Amino acid sequence: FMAQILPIRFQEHLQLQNLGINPANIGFSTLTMESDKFICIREKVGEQAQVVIIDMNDPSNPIRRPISADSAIMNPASKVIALKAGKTLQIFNIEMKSKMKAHTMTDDVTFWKWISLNTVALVTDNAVYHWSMEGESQPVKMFDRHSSLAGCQIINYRTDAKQKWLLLTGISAQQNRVVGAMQLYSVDRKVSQPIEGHAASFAQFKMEGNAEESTLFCFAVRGQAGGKLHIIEVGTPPTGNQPFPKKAVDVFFPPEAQNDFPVAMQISEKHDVVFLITKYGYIHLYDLETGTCIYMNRISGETIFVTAPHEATAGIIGVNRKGQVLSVCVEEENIIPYITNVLQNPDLALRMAVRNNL
């Protein structure tokens, strides 16, 4: 019943191999997508190291520049790029063809990522720094890394909106398992919490009855106890709010997917939906308020190794290993019909409609 409609809209936006990208460079170490505005790829043509920038507003005309850099990350909002070559970091203004800032670290930066329109996060072996692209300021140490992450491949770093709750995520191979290790740091309390987790995100959510938004932390894991998803409030609740009751639900893997696990998460605050992507290319949607599982399907034949929020649709956009750029968002006309008649969850249908009416 109602097989003709889904609660989502799947889209393919590009195929990177048709834009002259070599498939060997379509991967985590060489292809970055810091937001839905740009894809940046490092490639070596002959002996010449190049950066290719694909503007997602005009993708058919990608720009190549010779640049020697071990990593290249575009700003989420503006035509600004950060480049690193060993311990030396530079940020450039593309439009004005000019250096903005530079810094030389004393420790190697194993992982970095833009966390806002103006700030880069730097992860060394022993600490995490935030670096403004503005003014003269050097990077500022935010916290020391927790021992639980020693030896991990760092795969993500993100923060809540107010940059008071900071989350570093790595993974390690423990025999034939991929074990997630997160470090949640409170800026205000100066406290770290180690957490076994594979993918996470923050979100603001205004509870019925509350005048102020709650800051939520959502993470997913597949550990020895199976797949789990948790949704918890972090930090002091605004004065006058009731606290958000913590949610803990299962994350389903079919029997043929014993080695699948979560790899990416983005949240729609417009729809209060969590998007989780798995290693095997499955997407799951969960209600942010309750953790109820709305939808699961395999949407990609290849692993999706990078994701961002998809702004215009409040969805999730990603790149897979073959170079498909794909996205998933709420289908706003069909989601409530699906919840009503396929999930048979009228409580959720009502909550969604109450929010939509505003």
Ligand SMILES: Nc1ccc(CN2C(=O)c3cccc4cc(S(=O)(=O)[O-])cc(c34)C2=O)cc1
């Ligand atoms: N297509 C494109 C890409 C990057 C830029 C920004 N940009 C620049 O605009 C730029 C201007 C002048 C010298 C530069 C040197 C270097 S590097 O030698 O340190 O890798 C990098 C840059 C640069 C640089 O990235 C402008 C246009």
